Ligand binder design. Structure first.
Ligand code: BCL
Ligand code: BCL
Ligand code: BCL
Ligand code: BCL
Ligand SMILES: CC[C@H]1c2cc3[nH]c4c(c3C)C(=O)[C@H](C(=O)OC)c4c3nc(cc4[nH]c(cc(n2)[C@@H]1C)c(C(C)=O)c4C)[C@@H](C)[C@@H]3CCC(=O)OC/C=C(\C)CCC[C@H](C)CCC[C@H](C)CCCC(C)C
Ligand SMILES: CC[C@H]1c2cc3[nH]c4c(c3C)C(=O)[C@H](C(=O)OC)c4c3nc(cc4[nH]c(cc(n2)[C@@H]1C)c(C(C)=O)c4C)[C@@H](C)[C@@H]3CCC(=O)OC/C=C(\C)CCC[C@H](C)CCC[C@H](C)CCCC(C)C
Ligand SMILES: COC1=C(OC)C(=O)C(C/C=C(\C)CC/C=C(\C)CC/C=C(\C)CC/C=C(\C)CC/C=C(\C)CC/C=C(\C)CC/C=C(/C)CC/C=C(/C)CC/C=C(\C)CCC=C(C)C)=C(C)C1=O
Ligand SMILES: COC(C)(C)C(=O)C/C=C(\C)CC/C=C(\C)CC/C=C(\C)CCCC/C(C)=C/CC[C@H](C)CC/C=C(\C)CCC=C(C)C
Ligand SMILES: CCCCCCCC/C=C/CCCCCCCC(=O)OC[C@@H](O)COP(=O)(O)O
Ligand SMILES: CCCCCCCC/C=C\CCCCCCCC(=O)OC[C@@H](O)COP(=O)(O)O
Ligand SMILES: CCCCCCCC/C=C\CCCCCCCC(=O)OC[C@H](O)CO
Ligand SMILES: CCCCCCCCCCCC[N+](C)(C)[O-]
Ligand SMILES: CCCCCCCCCCCC[N+](C)(C)[O-]
Ligand SMILES: CCCCCCCCCCCCCCC
Ligand SMILES: [Fe+3]
Lengths: 301, 242, 281
C-alpha cells in the first residue's frame, strides 16, 4: 500500500502570492525559487516573505547578538581560525561575576559584553513577538500564535532576566555557549537539590513527552485519513466529513473517548504551551523560594 | 508546611482540572448527545455537559455553522441489528459498497466544491489549471490503471490538483466505456509502467461514484468517491489475488 | 451509547484472529481478540503489582517499587521477591503493549484507514524494550533495567546518566533532545495556526487554508502546507524516540567512558592539538 509519507508525483504551477487582506504589500518580497527537494515532503514554494519595520529591527538586533558572541569567540581563540574551529563548542560568553550584582558597570571582558549581547537578544525576540501578532492581525486571524509564543518567551525571560533579578545578580543567568550552557543546566540541578524532585519540572516533562505522544497520534491519524482528505482540517471543521468521523471513531474505539477536528488543536496548543509555562514556574521558584527540591519534596509527600 | 511552592503546585492542579473540563466539553461539539443503537437519546450522557453553541461565519457567503446543534445523518443507512443487546455489529442488509456503510461510508457533506481564499474552486483538473505540470516523479498520464485482480481497468487521462497546495489529489481514469472516474492519490501506486490500485478489482472501477461536472468535484462527491474506494479493502478482498 | 454518526461504521469484520467471536464493543470500547489479550496481560500484571506491594509492606502508590534482579543473577530467572515479579511484569507489560497495537490494527481495518497509528505506537514499544530488554541483554544482566516505581525510576535515570558524567554530552542524546524540543515547537505552531484560522478576529469570517500559508510565508518565508505539517509532526516525534533508543543502546555496550570524552577526539587531532592559548591549547 501507499503510505503518503513522501509525495509520489510533484506538480508545480505559478507561484502563490498569498492572501492580501490588510497586509501592506510594499513590504512583501518577491517570490523565491521552488525546491523540488522540499517538494517531496511538503510545499516546494519559497517565499515571498514580509519584511516591515519590526522584521528589520528584529533581524538587526538578532545579527548584533550573533556578532557580539562571535567577536568574543574570536577573541577567546586569539584570532586564530584553526583554534576557532577546534574549540568552537567550548567558547562561552559568561555573565558578570556575582560581585557586580545587578550593576551595568561590568567591564566588557568581565561580563560587560554579555549584557550588551543580552540587550540585542531581548530586542530581537520581543520585536519578533510583535511581528507574530501583527502578521496575524493584518490577515484578520486570531492571535493564538503570538499567545503560544509568549509561553516560550516566559521560560526564556525567567532564565535570563526575571530569576537573575530576583536573585540579585546577572551571574545567575545562562552563558552563551554550546557546551557551557549544558554545563550550566547540569550545575543548576545539582545546586538546587535535584530538579527531578521539582514538581513543576515533572509536569514540564509530562507535557514534553505528551507533546511527542500527541503529535505522533495526530500526525499518524491525519495521514491515516488523508485518503479521505482529512488534512483539509478547516473545511472538516466547517462541514464534517468521513475523515473526521473515522478519525474520531478510531480513538473512541481504542481508548473510549475522542476529539473533534477543531478540538484536537486545542488539546495540541495547550499540551505544548504547558511545557514552558510550568517549566518557567519551576525555574522561577528555584533558589528564590525552594533551595533543595529533594528535601522540600520529603516534607510534601 | 504551607509554603509558596506548595500553594503554586496546588493552584496549578486546580487550574489543570478546569482546563481538562473545558477541553473535554469543547470536544463534544460534534456527535453528541450520545444515542442508543435505535437512535433515541441515551440515558447516561457522561459527567460532562454539552457546550453552549458557538457560531462560525463561513467565507464566500456560505452561511453560518452553529455547533452543537440538532444533527442528522441526512441519508438512509442500510444496516440491521444483529443482537438484542447493545455492543454487537450491525450487519449490512444490501451491497455495502453501493449502500456506503462500514469502511465504504460517506458523509452527507455540502454538495458544493471547497473554495480557495479567492473564492475559486480549490481542486481542478490539470488540463484546466494554467501553468501546472508534473515537476518530479513518474508522470502517470497515459499510463494503464490496474486493479487487484491484475486486470487493466483503464488509463490515466488527467491529474486533479489542489491549486493553493500545488498537490495532486485525484487521478482521473478513463474506463473501457469512455467515461471517467476519480481515484484518490493516496490509494494508488504510481509505477514505471502502470498505476496499480490494490483497493478495487478492475470491474469495481465502474462502481466508483461519478461527478456531475467534468471540471469540478463537490465535497459530497469526494466523500462518496473516497469512501467507495477505501471500502474496497474490506469488501473486494475476495477478488484480491494472493 | 453511540456518537450520532457512529452506527453506520459498526459493521462486522476486520479481525485478524478469531473471526466474529470477539467482534463486538463494550460501551465505546472495541474488543476483538487483542482486546481480550490486552485485558488478560493487564489484569495479571496489575495483580502481580498488588502482590509485590504486599511483599513490600505499603499500599501508598508513591512507595511501591518492583525492582529487577540483582546484577549477580545475570540474565537468569530470579525468585519472585528478588526480581522475579519484575520479570513476569515485564512479560505482561510487553504482552499488553503489543496486544494494544494489534487491536489498533484491527480497528484500522474495520474503519478502512491507514495503519500509521499502530506503526507509530511501535516506536514507543521499541524504546521501552530498548531499556528493559535489548540493553540489559547486551550488558549481561536484567539488573541494568529500570525499576517500576514512580520515583525510583527517576533515580535510575539519574544514576544511569551520571555513570557517564554529564549525559548531555552523548551526541545521540543531543539529537534526540533537539527533535523533542522541535516537536513541541511544531505542535504549538500547528495548533495555534488552525485555531487562529477557525476562530479569527471578532467581526470576521472564518479564514481559509490560504490564510494559513500566507501567515507563515509572511512570518518566515516558507509554508510546509497542511499535509506536510502532519508528516513533519509524525517524523519529529518518531525521530526523537528513535534517537532516544539509539543513545541508550550504545551506552554501556560500545561506549563506557564519560561522554565528554567523545568530543575530545575533535579536540586533540594532531594538526591542532598543540596550538596553545585557547581552551584546548
Ligand atoms: C522515558 C525515559 C525514562 C523515564 C523518565 C521520566 C522522567 C525524567 C519523568 C518521568 C515521569 C513520568 N513517567 Mg517515566 N520514564 C521512563 C519510562 C516510563 C514508563 C514506561 C513503561 O516506559 C511509564 C509508564 C512512565 C510513566 C511516567 C509517569 C509516572 C510520569 C509522567 C509521564 C507522562 O505523562 O508521559 C506522557 C504521557 C502522557 C501525558 C499520557 C498519560 C500517561 C499516564 C499518566 C501514565 C501513568 C502510568 C502509571 C503511573 C503506571 C501504570 C498504572 C498501571 C495501572 C499499573 N515512565 C523511562 C525509564 N519519566 C515524570 C514524573 O513526574 O515522574 C514522577 C518525570 O519527571
Ligand atoms: C542534569 C540536568 C537536569 C535538568 C535540568 C534542567 C534545567 C536547569 C531546566 C530543565 C528544563 C527542562 N527539562 Mg530537565 N533536567 C534533567 C532531566 C530531564 C529529563 C530526563 C530524561 O531526566 C527530561 C525529559 C527533561 C526535560 C526538560 C524539559 C521538559 C524542560 C525544557 C522545556 C523546553 O522546551 O525548553 C526549551 C525551550 C526554551 C528554553 C525556550 C526558548 C524560547 C526563546 C524565545 C527562543 C529564542 C531563540 C533564539 C532567538 C535563537 C533563535 C535562532 C533562530 C532559529 C534563527 N529534563 C536533570 C534533572 N532541565 C527547563 C525547565 O523548565 O525546568 C523546569 C530548565 O530550565
Ligand atoms: C532547557 C534547559 C536548558 C537547555 C538545555 C539543552 C540541552 C540539554 C540540549 C540543548 C540543545 C540546544 N539548545 Mg539549549 N537549553 C536552554 C536554553 C537554550 C536557549 C535559550 C534562548 O534560552 C537557546 C537558544 C538554546 C539553544 C540550543 C541549541 C544549541 C540546541 C538545540 C535546541 C533545539 O532543539 O531548538 C529547537 C529550535 C529549532 C529547531 C529552530 C532552529 C534553532 C537553531 C538550530 C538554534 C540556534 C541557537 C544558536 C544561535 C546556535 C549556534 C550554532 C553554531 C554553534 C554557531 N538553548 C536551557 C538553559 N539545550 C541540545 C543540543 O544539541 O545541545 C548541543 C541539547 O542537547
Ligand atoms: C540526570 C539525568 C541525565 C540524563 C540521563 C538519561 C538517561 C539515563 C536516559 C535519558 C533519556 C532521555 N533523555 Mg536525558 N538526561 C539528562 C537530561 C535531559 C534533558 C535536559 C533538559 O537536561 C532532556 C530534555 C533530556 C531528554 C531525554 C529524552 C531524549 C529521553 C527520554 C524520552 C524517551 O526515551 O522516551 C521513550 C519513551 C518511552 C520509554 C515510553 C514507553 C511507553 C510504553 C510503550 C507504553 C506505556 C503504557 C503505560 C504503562 C500504560 C498507561 C496506561 C494508561 C495509564 C491508561 N534529558 C541528565 C543529564 N536521559 C532516556 C532514553 O533515551 O531512553 C531511551 C534514558 O533512559
Ligand atoms: C511552546 C513551547 C515551544 C516553543 C514555541 C514557539 N517558539 C516560537 C513560537 C512558538 C509558539 C513562535 O511563534 C516563534 C516563531 O516565529 O516560530 C516560527 C518561535 C520561535 N522559536 C524559536 C526558537 C526556539 N524555540 C524553542 C523552544 C520552544 N518554542 C518550545 C519547545 C527553542 C529551544 C531552545 O528549544 C528554540 C531555539 C525561533 C525559531 C522562533 C523565534 C524567532 C526570534 O525570536 O527571532 C529573533 C532572532 C533573530 C531574527 C536572529 C536570526 C539570525 C541568527 C542570529 C543567525 C544568523 C546566521 C548567519 C548570520 C547567516 C547564515 C546564512 C546561511 C545559512 C545562508
Ligand atoms: C513514539 C512517540 C510517542 C508516543 C506515541 C504513541 N503512544 C501511544 C500511541 C502512540 C502513537 C498509541 O496509539 C497509544 C494510545 O492508545 O494512545 C492513546 C499509546 C500510548 N502511550 C501511552 C503512554 C506513554 N507513551 C509515552 C511516550 C510516547 N508515546 C512517545 C514519546 C510515555 C512516556 C513515558 O513518554 C507514556 C507514559 C499510553 C497512554 C498508550 C498505550 C496504552 C497501552 O498500551 O495500554 C495497554 C496496557 C495497559 C492497559 C496496562 C498495562 C499494565 C502493565 C501490565 C503493568 C504496569 C507496567 C509498567 C511497566 C509499570 C510502569 C511504572 C512507571 C512508574 C515506570
Ligand atoms: C484529527 O483526529 C483526531 C481525533 O479525532 C477527531 C482524535 O480524536 C484524536 C485523539 C486525541 C484526543 C482525544 C486528545 C486527548 C488525548 C490525549 C491527551 C492523549 C493522552 C491519552 C490518555 C491519557 C488517555 C489514555 C487512556 C487509555 C489508554 C484508555 C483507558 C484504558 C482502558 C479503559 C483500557 C480498557 C480497554 C481494553 C482493555 C480493550 C478491551 C476492552 C474490554 C472492555 C475488555 C473486556 C473483555 C471481556 C472478556 C468482556 C466480556 C463481555 C462479554 C463476553 C459480553 C457478552 C455479550 C452477550 C450479551 C452474549 C486525534 C489524535 C486526532 O488526530
Ligand atoms: C566568523 O564568525 C562571526 C564573527 C561572523 C560570528 O559571529 C560567528 C558567530 C557564532 C559562532 C555565534 C555562536 C552563538 C552561539 C554559540 C549561541 C549559543 C546560545 C545559546 C545556547 C543560548 C543559551 C541561553 C541564552 C539565554 C537564556 C539568554 C537569556 C537572555 C535574557 C532573557 C535577556 C535579558 C536581558 C538583559 C540581561 C539585558 C537587559 C536590557 C534590557 C533593555 C532589558
Ligand atoms: C505567575 C506565573 C504565571 C505565568 C506568567 C505569564 C506567562 C505567559 C504565558 C501566557 C499564557 C500561555 C498561552 C495561552 C494558551 C495558548 C493560547 C490560547 O489558546 O488562547 C488564546 C486565544 O484566546 C486566542 O486569542 P484571541 O485571538 O486574541 O482571542
Ligand atoms: C468540573 C471541574 C471544575 C474545576 C474547578 C473550576 C475551574 C478551575 C479554574 C480555572 C480553569 C480555567 C480554564 C480556562 C481555559 C481557557 C478558556 C479560554 O481561553 O476561553 C476563551 C477562548 O475560548 C477563546 O479562544 P478562541 O475562541 O479560539 O479565540
Ligand atoms: C525568502 C525565502 C526564505 C526561506 C526561509 C525558510 C525558513 C523555514 C523555517 C521554518 C519552517 C518550518 C515551520 C514548521 C511549523 C509549521 C506550522 C504549521 O501548522 O504550518 C502548516 C502550513 O505551513 C500551513 O497550512
Ligand atoms: C492537557 C493534558 C493533561 C495531561 C496531564 C499529565 C499528568 C502527569 C502528572 C505528572 C505528575 C508530576 N508530579 C510531580 C506533580 O507528580
Ligand atoms: C490526562 C489526560 C486525560 C484526560 C481525560 C479526559 C476524560 C474524558 C472522558 C469523557 C468520556 C466521554 N464519553 C465516553 C462519556 O463520551
Ligand atoms: C487519565 C485516564 C483517562 C481514562 C479515560 C477512560 C475512558 C473514558 C470513559 C468512557 C466511559 C463511557 C461511559 C459513557 C458513555
Ligand atoms: Fe492538524
Amino acid at each position: 500500500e501507499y503510505q503518503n509519507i513522501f509525495t509520489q508525483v510533484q506538480v508545480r504551477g505559478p507561484a502563490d502570492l498569498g492572501m492580501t487582506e490588510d497586509v501592506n504589500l510594499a513590504n512583501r518580497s518577491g517570490v523565491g525559487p521552488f525546491s523540488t527537494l522540499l517538494g517531496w515532503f511538503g510545499n516546494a514554494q519559497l517565499g515571498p516573505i514580509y519584511l516591515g519595520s519590526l522584521g528589520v529591527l528584529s533581524l538587526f538586533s538578532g545579527l548584533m547578538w550573533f556578532f557580539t558572541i562571535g567577536i568574543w569567540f574570536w577573541y577567546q581563540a586569539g584570532w586564530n581560525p584553526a583554534v576557532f574551529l577546534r574549540d568552537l563548542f567550548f567558547f562561552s560568553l559568561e555573565p558578570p561575576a556575582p560581585e557586580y550584582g545587578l550593576s551595568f558597570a561590568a567591564p566588557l571582558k568581565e561580563g560587560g559584553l554579555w549584557l550588551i549581547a543580552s540587550f540585542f537578544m531581548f530586542v530581537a525576540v520581543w520585536s519578533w513577538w510583535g511581528r507574530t501578532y501583527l502578521r496575524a492581525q493584518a490577515l484578520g486571524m486570531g492571535k493564538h500564535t503570538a499567545w503560544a509564543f509568549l509561553s516560550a518567551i516566559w521560560l526564556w525571560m525567567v532564565l535570563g532576566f526575571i530569576r537573575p533579578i530576583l536573585m540579585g545578580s546577572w551571574s545567575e543567568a545562562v552563558p552563551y555557549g554550546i557546551f557551557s550552557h549544558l554545563d550550566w543546566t547540569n550545575n543548576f540541578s545539582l545546586v538546587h537539590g535535584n530538579l527531578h524532585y521539582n514538581p513543576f519540572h515533572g509536569l514540564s516533562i509530562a507535557f514534553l513527552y505528551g507533546s511527542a505522544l500527541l503529535f505522533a497520534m495526530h500526525g499518524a491519524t491525519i495521514l491515516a485519513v488523508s485518503r479521505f482528505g482529512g488534512e483539509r482540517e478547516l473545511e472538516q471543521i466547517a462541514d464534517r466529513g468521513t475523515a473526521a468521523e473515522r478519525a474520531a471513531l478510531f480513538w473512541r474505539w481504542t481508548m473510549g473517548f475522542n476529539a473533534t477536528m477543531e478540538g484536537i488543536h486545542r488539546w495540541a496548543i495547550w499540551m505544548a504551551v504547558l511545557v514552558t509555562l510550568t517549566g518557567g514556574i519551576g525555574i522561577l521558584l528555584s533558589g528564590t523560594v525552594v533551595d533543595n527540591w529533594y528535601v522540600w519534596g520529603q516534607n510534601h509527600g | 508546611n504551607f509554603d509558596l511552592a506548595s500553594l503554586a503546585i496546588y493552584s496549578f492542579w486546580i487550574f489543570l482540572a478546569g482546563l481538562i473540563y473545558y477541553l473535554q466539553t469543547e470536544n463534544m461539539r460534534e456527535g453528541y448527545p450520545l444515542e442508543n443503537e435505535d437512535g433515541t437519546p441515551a440515558a447516561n450522557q457522561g459527567p460532562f455537559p454539552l457546550p453552549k453553541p458557538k457560531t462560525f461565519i463561513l467565507p464566500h457567503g456560505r452561511g453560518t455553522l452553529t455547533v452543537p446543534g440538532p444533527e442528522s445523518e441526512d441519508r438512509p443507512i442500510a444496516l440491521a441489528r444483529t443482537a438484542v443487546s447493545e455492543g454487537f455489529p450491525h450487519a449490512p442488509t444490501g451491497d455495502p459498497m453501493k449502500d456506503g456503510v462500514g469502511p465504504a461510508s460517506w458523509v452527507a457533506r455540502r454538495d458544493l466544491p471547497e473554495l480557495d481564499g479567492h473564492g475559486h474552486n480549490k481542486i481542478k483538473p490539470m488540463k484546466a489549471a494554467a501553468g501546472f505540470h508534473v515537476s518530479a516523479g513518474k508522470n502517470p498520464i497515459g499510463l494503464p490503471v490496474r486493479g487487484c485482480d491484475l486486470e487493466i481497468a483503464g488509463k490515466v487521462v488527467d491529474i486533479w490538483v489542489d491549486i493553493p497546495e500545488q498537490m495532486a489529489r485525484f487521478l482521473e481514469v478513463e474506463l473501457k466505456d469512455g467515461s471517467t472516474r476519480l481515484l484518490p492519490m493516496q490509494m494508488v501506486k504510481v509505477q514505471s509502467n502502470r498505476v496499480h490500485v490494490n483497493a478495487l478489482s478492475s470491474d469495481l472501477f465502474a462502481g466508483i461514484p461519478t461527478i456531475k461536472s467534468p471540471t469540478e468535484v463537490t465535497l459530497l462527491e469526494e466523500d462518496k468517491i473516497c469512501g467507495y474506494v477505501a471500502g474496497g479493502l474490506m469488501y473486494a478482498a475476495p477478488k484480491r489475488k494472493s | 451509547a453511540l456518537l450520532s454518526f457512529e452506527r453506520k461504521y459498526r459493521v462486522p469484520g476486520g479481525t485478524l484472529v478469531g473471526g466474529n467471536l470477539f467482534d463486538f464493543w463494550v460501551g465505546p470500547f472495541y474488543v476483538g481478540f487483542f482486546g481480550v489479550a490486552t485485558f488478560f496481560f493487564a489484569a495479571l500484571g496489575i495483580i502481580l503489582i498488588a502482590w509485590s506491594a504486599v511483599l513490600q509492606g505499603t499500599w501508598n502508590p508513591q512507595l511501591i517499587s518492583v525492582y529487577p534482579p540483582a546484577l549477580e543473577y545475570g540474565l537468569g530467572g530470579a525468585p519472585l521477591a528478588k526480581g522475579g515479579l519484575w520479570q513476569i511484569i515485564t512479560i505482561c507489560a510487553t504482552g499488553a503493549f503489543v496486544s494494544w497495537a494489534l487491536r489498533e490494527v484491527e480497528i484500522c481495518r474495520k474503519l478502512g484507514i491507514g495503519y500509521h497509528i499502530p506503526f507509530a505506537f511501535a516506536f514507543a514499544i521499541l524504546a521501552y524494550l530498548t531499556l528493559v530488554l535489548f540493553r540489559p541483554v547486551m550488558m549481561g544482566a536484567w539488573g541494568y533495567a529500570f525499576p517500576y516505581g514512580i520515583w525510583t525510576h527517576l533515580d535510575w535515570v539519574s544514576n544511569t546518566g551520571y555513570t557517564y558524567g554529564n549525559f548531555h554530552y552523548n551526541p545521540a542524546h543531543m539529537i534526540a533532545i533537539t527533535f523533542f524540543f522541535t516537536n513541541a515547537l511544531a505542535l504549538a505552531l500547528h495548533g495555534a495556526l488552525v485555531l487562529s484560522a477557525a476562530n479569527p478576529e471578532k467581526g470576521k469570517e472564518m479564514r481559509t487554508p490560504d490564510h494559513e500559508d500566507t501567515f507563515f510565508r509572511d512570518l518566515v518565508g516558507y509554508s510546509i502546507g497542511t499535509l506536510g505539517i502532519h508528516r513533519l509532526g509524525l517524523l519529529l516525534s518518531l525521530s526523537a524516540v528513535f534517537f532516544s533508543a539509539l543513545c541508550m543502546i550504545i551506552t554501556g555496550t560500545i561506549w563506557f567512558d564519560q561522554w565528554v570524552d567523545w568530543w575530545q577526539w575533535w579536540v586533540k587531532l594532531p594538526w591542532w592539538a598543540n596550538i596553545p592559548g585557547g581552551i584546548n591549547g
